[PDB]
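ZP: hey, is the magnesium ion complex queued? I don't see it on the tracker
AM: it wasn't, my bad. submitting now with these inputs:
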Amino acid sequence: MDPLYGYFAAVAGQDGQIDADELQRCLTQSGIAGGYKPFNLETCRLMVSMLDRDMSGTMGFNEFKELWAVLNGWRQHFISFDTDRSGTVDPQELQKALTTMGFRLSPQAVNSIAKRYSTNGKITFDDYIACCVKLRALTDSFRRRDTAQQGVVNFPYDDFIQCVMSV
Amino acid sequence: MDPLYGYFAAVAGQDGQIDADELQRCLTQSGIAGGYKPFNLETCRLMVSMLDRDMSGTMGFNEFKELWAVLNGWRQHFISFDTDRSGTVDPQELQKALTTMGFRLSPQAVNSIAKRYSTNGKITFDDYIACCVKLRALTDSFRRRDTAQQGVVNFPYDDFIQCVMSV
Ligand SMILES: COc1cccc2c1C(=O)c1c(O)c3c(c(O)c1C2=O)C[C@@](O)(C(=O)CO)C[C@@H]3O[C@H]1C[C@H](N)[C@H](O)[C@H](C)O1
Ligand SMILES: [Mg+2]
Ligand SMILES: [Mg+2]
Ligand SMILES: [Mg+2]
Ligand SMILES: [Mg+2]
Ligand SMILES: [Mg+2]
């Protein structure tokens, strides 16, 4: 028996599967939230999107074990940039946190990411994770259309929507 | 002159310019929502960044006027398929609604949208807008970069991300 099984277990027992609504309950039950403002649902939608890989709208347990790790990894990397444990982070001190944990972008590119997600000036922990989660799946999408291994991908119109809207 | 000024006037004189928290209000104040539930703020950042080239987190009244009209039209098509007055519409009903209002999307593409934005087999009115919103701002970005005029645009990894994280 894995410890993370139980949180996942009690929510949606038979399918062996959880959607965003099911996912949200069991994350914050297990305290990956970890003191901070517990994950709201439209964040959890992306997490599901990221990891289903079949358009199921759901992810099973070993897909769930995988997630908990990524969010722990990212949770601590947040706590570095807000050791006061307020909830928040200013956009510029966020700017570095973005660059650090990998696969990063230029000072001109990074701003775009902190411009959009800046909620009343500050950035929330929920906004932070939700940004990471959105990008990971965008990298992982870009990856799989970049069969050439270049870092430059041709996008048709219908393909570009079909891609971007799924995440 | 214009009846839409009062609703807008009430919400902000930041300059003569509103944010999402304000926009949310004046929409529901104007009752474009129209029986259905107020457009929630998760949607109403899209509505800013859709018509915000200058990354301010703001739109103005003349931009607003565009928005309200697009919605008044979009809303109408929804209410074709929702003679219920329910706030819910099936993902076939959605697929056809996307066609009739002028989107060049394939069988495979709208499937991949409809799948995503559905949650228990039907789509909320709020969701249908945020789907429709997202389309029209991503296609405006694709046509912004398609001065190739081909139906194909080519994307660096640092450009592809900074495109999709703005919306
Ligand atoms: C999210 O991860 C990825 C997933 C799939 C493909 C990619 C990447 C990726 O991160 C990536 C890069 O970070 C870089 C490049 C790249 O092609 C990719 C991917 O293709 C080259 C680069 O010049 C580009 O601007 C083009 O994207 C800059 C950068 O170079 C970095 C990493 C290079 N491998 C090399 O070590 C160079 C010296 O620094
Ligand atoms: Mg799955
Ligand atoms: Mg701080
Ligand atoms: Mg305000
Ligand atoms: Mg503007
Ligand atoms: Mg119906």
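AM: back. Residues 61-81 of chain A form the longest helix (21 residues).
ZP: great, adding it to the tracker
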